[PDB]
Subunit: 311 residues, 5 copies
């Protein structure tokens, strides 16, 4: 089977549509998400034309192997989509109406800069490579683009699923390629991060600052070192569920900055002890009294600066 | 092969029924489960009708390719079901009795609000898309709905497997779609959580309260900080086997609330030391004596409040 | 191809045999194991009978598609077995001798009550569904049931692989089903648990009891709290390689009971300090001297009670 | 297609050869390794013989379906090999030269007794089951057995890949089976274990022995208990990357023996304190001075004994 | 179908060209990476030549089964590539232009010596085995070798994708094999390692050196031992995301060397205490004052030496 011949010199327009049934496994480390959807294609193949008076049927149904079907592929998939043809219907004029249900792992880079208060635009790129005989161009039938009301992506809010109607027509290996951009806009549900990571991490930091109301070096060492170990645990936990970024993230900056506060607290606790041993507790008392105000103030200002830079 | 023609203008009723053989791999983080079951379908095709006295046989067996079979799909599956046709039998009047054995990974959302004292209603949605020639409607043959007595879902109790007999008939991309809801009711076996997470978590908390019976700041710092670290370990262990929810869970609220008790214990231990150093042990003695009663009382009341809000 | 017709009204007996080649991946958490074996089937089909004198051959080899083969399935498998037909041979009377090599992931519940000193009976259930024309019954050819001498299941001892010769004949979806039980008896190699989990866990417990020969509350707090944290690590390690059981296990009971010993040691250490501070060291000395005998005695008796209840 | 008929009563010799292209994924816990190799088979089929003078051609190429090919299988594979036929060539005498490229996950038991200073002999067992018409025997064509110079098994040194030329001919289910043993000799690259596990583990042990140069019970308790916790971490790390063995391993013995040194150090530290409190520091000084020599000496001797028993 | 016959005795040149669409999953531990690309092949088959005047067409499209296609395989792949033929086009002279889209898991070794400041040269080896009729040689059509501008390998910078134009022609099992080397040059994005592993690791080390400004053995023991435990955590974290190398890596050497600094700090802290107890604080003061300068100086010099040896 060869492609449909042109009436004049026009390219073959293949109208497309993606209808998402399910959205799952959005992997941050992998920068991949899974989709189970309907792919609908429509083109005119005048060779399939029939008279329903003779045929006895107003619409003809064909098996995929029986007729010519345009080779529509996905650009950013891991492996070739698992597809199952739902229906192929030809009307008397030769207008084929193809429908398949597919599942694919999609590659969509994520921007972790504002994590976990980030939003993402996922992409599903449809492509068609033109044949020798005639050029194939993609189109969007907006009536056949959508998503199920029950589509739930765990820990994410699905904002919109739209298509960039104008295809990206370009040359590749001396043949015309027509690309289409299906954009799924999502925003992260940041709720859980607050009682599970943020607040537990701030509590262990404030516990370390209780060493500013203690004269016991032994207990202060314990307070600041133990809480530093708990912060290393939170740092590990956070970085394990995230890919290695060549840029600084919001959570990354905060986690890092907090290490400096622990370092300076160790220095303060050390300075205080050296002075007490040197029989200068009045000077040690001045530094400790200052730290009590300085540490929360500098922490609060630094966080205002960071939130301002990122958001 | 085309669909069976209507006698008048009525839609084609496809009677259905799922019989679960196996239920396994209920992944909480993924909100998926694996099922191995029998799918039974039945419809009338008058073109397949025959006289039993003339044909000598009462039943005719066909290969799937030989006759028309309705395209029944599952809405909430990761990938298309692995199916194997068991039998296709035609009665004299033309009633086809189809049976297949399938295995599928089902996507069904879970409500972790009352975890690990939660119950779930898992869903298996059957769907059929109408053809251009005639509309297809789904039905439930209750005689062919069920589950094996040996069906065991590890760490869960299977209550019931029923079907919502009235299908959800709706339009989708200008064609009628008939949906059916098969509901598997399960309830979590909470036993193991008590000696593995709950009681160890409460013991470490009560160990921290022994600092209210000690005047040694160094030892108190150790008691409260060490037990806090052990609580962080349990918090991590619990949150790793659960998805990030946009709502507060029961275990989530308790775990969080316990961090406040540790924070206040550090404050108390600090307050007591500041007073002893300031040569005010009588006032420190009053606060420590109060804490001894206050901490268990407030803990007990807070838990009553939480259990009331969540149950 | 239809099933063999009966001479009278007798059911068709399909003689079966499983010969295990490999046994691997026994997953405790999943309650599954993988098997690679030979499945041998034998039935009489008189339509396939021949005269060896005229034919010149004492046997006839057929391709699976050429003749009727009974649809034998496994009940407790994740997905349908990966099978490859080794040979199909017909004798002059029409006795077909089928042989295939398969691999399957078998779902089989485990009893962790006596873990890690437990024994298990793994199951492989063979099933056949009767056709409308005639009923099919399963049989066991004991000469064709066995296992390779080199079959090794990592961390387990394979005791026996036998078959329950009498099939479970029952109705399912208005058709007779004949089930067969192949039982693989295995017993866990408990050796490794002793130097890796048991003895380390007892050593850390005995280290906590050295606080009964110390008057230093600070050091005692450290001894009992640190060893408690190491016990939490051993509890987590053990529970991670085991499924959540609705019953108490032997290792589970011991691990749990040990938390009580840590709790009481903290209480003792606290009591001793309160008395020393209250200028009552003679009373503290009495309690500490008692604990030195009480703790090992109660530990030894509790363990005797537990071992008795579980074995 | 039937097997080649015998000239007399001799069995059919199928000459074999495995040429390793890639060796990867040697899983210690699973006792499996993945291979990607060439399988070459050669046998004489007189029915395929021809004249090269009249046929003009020296060799005839056939598709696998066109001629009879012996069913060669692997004994110790997880699932049946992924094979792709490279070439089938027939010489004028009728000698068939088959070549396929395969990939398989091989099950081969490992001996962890001398780990991580262990060597292994991996096995690839080739097998052929005789047909009713004639018996099939395997052979090794040493000219067609080898490995690529670039074959790299991560963290292992590949010593040799040879074949045990004499097949294991035996009866199985009343038919002759001919087995061949392909042995891949490898030895573990132990380098990394020294700076990552061994030396860190010895350093933490020597840190615990600095308590023999301290009179501070509080500090000694900290030294011995903290280092014990770090040893538990290393024990967990090591045992997680190894299967549960019914025998004692070299690393297993050392790790275990080290727990005894920690236990005895706690006892010494406790004994020293009890004496100092009892106003007997001279006796405590004698024991502490003895321990300083005893602990390294007994450690050094115990290790000599262990290395002797294991090597 | 047989290969194209030679005009003289020349080998058949198959021009090749890989165009990368996607690069993902670079696993360091596994030394693998996944690729999704276009494979283009071109060869002259005179049997397929035609006159464009008589035929009425300038290009003839064929199905893969219709004509002879050279068996091109990848050397370093886990399993055989997942391929889908895009187009096969024949010009009047008989020049075939083949195009397929494939996906493969490629096994390419990595050099961790300079990790995480390392660069790698990934390899894709194309191979062809000569047939008995004629020899096949590979070539590179540089016009058809490239990569998409959007090709992103997470945590890596893609420098270039080129091909070694001269094939590696060699004998294998008495047949000519022609190998081609496609080299993908990448360099690691080291940014994230600095705030996540390097700086936290240096901070904990500097915290341990505050024991040189303290006379409290108890607090010093705590400072040096706790920070040592945090270093063990960072060593474990680093080594888990890396394979076991038979050579020393840059990060490996630093991590190891740091253990020596902790060991010597314990020795210093111990020496200081022994002297203070022996009523020699003046000598202890000299050693502690020396350590304050020695430790940072030796650390800085050792690091200069290491960076020099590795870069
Ligand atoms: C009377 C003392 C009340 C202390 C209340 C502390 C409130 C902390 C609120 C945190 C909110 C998030 C700077 C952080 C250290 C906490 C204060 C330590 C208590 C000092 C006691 C001094 C005794 C006179
Ligand atoms: C430790 C540091 C605590 C982090 C504080 C949140 C940072 C922030 O302010 O986050 C901001 C985001 C919302 O951002 P958005 O509206 O989606 O972005 C678009 C914004 N433009 C268009 C103006 C650029 O969340 C919130 O509403 C904050 C709620 C969480 C509070 C947690 C308190 C603990
Ligand atoms: C004679 C004192 C007995 C103490 C028994 C403690 C019972 C705890 C029951 C927990 C049940 C779950 C408040 C929690 C701290 C525990 C009490 C610490 C003991 C104080 C000793 C004072 C010495 C006079
Ligand atoms: C510290 C916190 C201790 C945990 C307390 C259990 C929470 C609870 O009270 O859980 C309640 C659930 C049962 O809920 P249900 O019957 O399924 O809900 C449906 C009820 N309606 C429809 C009326 C709303 O479990 C129990 O029977 C409690 C047994 C576990 C005791 C654990 C003690 C430790
Ligand atoms: C003279 C002291 C001998 C110590 C021998 C210890 C035997 C331990 C056997 C373990 C068998 C498993 C009860 C658990 C603590 C162990 C004893 C601590 C030492 C007490 C020091 C007393 C100083 C006079
Ligand atoms: C902590 C306490 C130590 C563990 C108690 C011993 C094991 C057990 O509880 O029992 C012992 C089990 C065997 O039991 P079985 O043969 O499988 O049961 C069948 C019994 N009937 C038929 C009578 C019901 O293994 C052993 O011989 C393990 C010995 C190693 C002891 C661990 C030393 C540390
Ligand atoms: C002058 C004392 C130098 C100490 C040098 C220690 C070398 C350790 C070599 C380990 C090589 C592997 C027994 C192990 C404890 C280490 C010795 C603790 C130092 C004691 C100081 C006493 C002060 C007079
Ligand atoms: C503390 C733990 C100390 C461990 C010492 C290694 C044991 C050993 O001596 O291991 C021995 C193995 C080599 O053994 P093989 O030649 O492969 O065995 C065959 C031997 N027969 C045939 C004679 C029986 O490694 C070595 O060359 C040792 C180098 C590593 C030293 C690490 C020091 C830290
Ligand atoms: C007034 C004291 C200032 C301390 C400044 C410390 C600067 C650290 C810079 C780190 C750069 C990365 C040697 C590492 C230990 C840090 C110094 C401990 C402070 C000693 C206080 C003595 C009191 C007189
Ligand atoms: C602990 C010590 C800190 C680590 C120092 C990094 C080693 C280094 O200096 O690494 C150098 C590499 C670049 O190497 P390259 O140019 O790709 O190699 C080719 C070099 N030839 C061809 C000359 C041999 O990156 C950097 O500029 C490192 C910048 C980050 C510094 C980390 C700060 C903390
Ligand atoms: Cl398509
Ligand atoms: Cl695709
Ligand atoms: Cl169907
Ligand atoms: Cl489906
Ligand atoms: Cl079968
Ligand atoms: Cl099956
Ligand atoms: Cl084969
Ligand atoms: Cl195989
Ligand atoms: Cl190809
Ligand atoms: Cl390939
Ligand atoms: Cl050569
Ligand atoms: Cl050649
Ligand atoms: Na087609
Ligand atoms: Na059909
Ligand atoms: Na059949
Ligand atoms: Na064949
Ligand atoms: Na071909
Ligand atoms: Na301490």
């Amino acid at each position: 089977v060869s492609p449909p011949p042109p009436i004049a010199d026009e390219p073959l327009t293949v109208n497309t549509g993606i209808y998402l049934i399910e959205c799952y496994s959005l992997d941050d480390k992998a920068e991949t998400f899974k989709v189970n959807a309907f792919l609908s294609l429509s083109w005119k193949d005048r060779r399939l034309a029939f008279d329903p008076v003779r045929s006895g049927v107003r619409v003809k149904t064909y098996e995929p192997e029986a007729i010519w079907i345009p080779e529509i592929r996905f650009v950013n998939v891991e492996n070739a989509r698992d597809a199952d043809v739902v229906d192929i219907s030809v009307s008397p004029d030769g207008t084929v109406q193809y429908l398949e249900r597919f599942s694919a792992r999609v590659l969509s880079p994520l921007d972790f800069r504002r994590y976990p208060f980030d939003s993402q635009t996922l992409h599903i790129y449809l492509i068609v490579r033109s044949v020798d005989t005639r050029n194939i161009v993609l189109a969007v039938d907006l009536e056949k683009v959508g998503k199920n009301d029950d589509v739930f992506l765990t820990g994410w809010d699905i904002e919109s699923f739209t298509a960039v109607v104008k295809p990206a027509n370009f040359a590749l290996e001396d043949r015309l390629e027509s690309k289409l951009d299906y954009q799924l806009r999502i925003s992260r549900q940041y709720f859980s991060y607050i009682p599970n990571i943020i607040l537990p991490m701030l509590f262990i930091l404030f516990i370390s600052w209780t060493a500013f109301w203690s004269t016991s070096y032994e207990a202060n060492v314990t307070l600041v070192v133990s809480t530093l170990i708990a912060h290393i645990a939170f740092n590990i936990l956070v970085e394990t569920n995230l890919p290695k970024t060549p840029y600084m993230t919001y959570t990354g900056a905060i986690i890092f900055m907090i290490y400096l506060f622990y370092f300076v607290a160790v220095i303060e606790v050390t300075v205080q002890h050296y002075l007490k041993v040197e029989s200068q507790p009045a000077r040690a008392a001045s530094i400790t009294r200052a730290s009590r105000i300085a540490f929360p103030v500098v922490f609060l200002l630094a966080n205002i600066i960071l939130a301002f830079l990122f958001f």
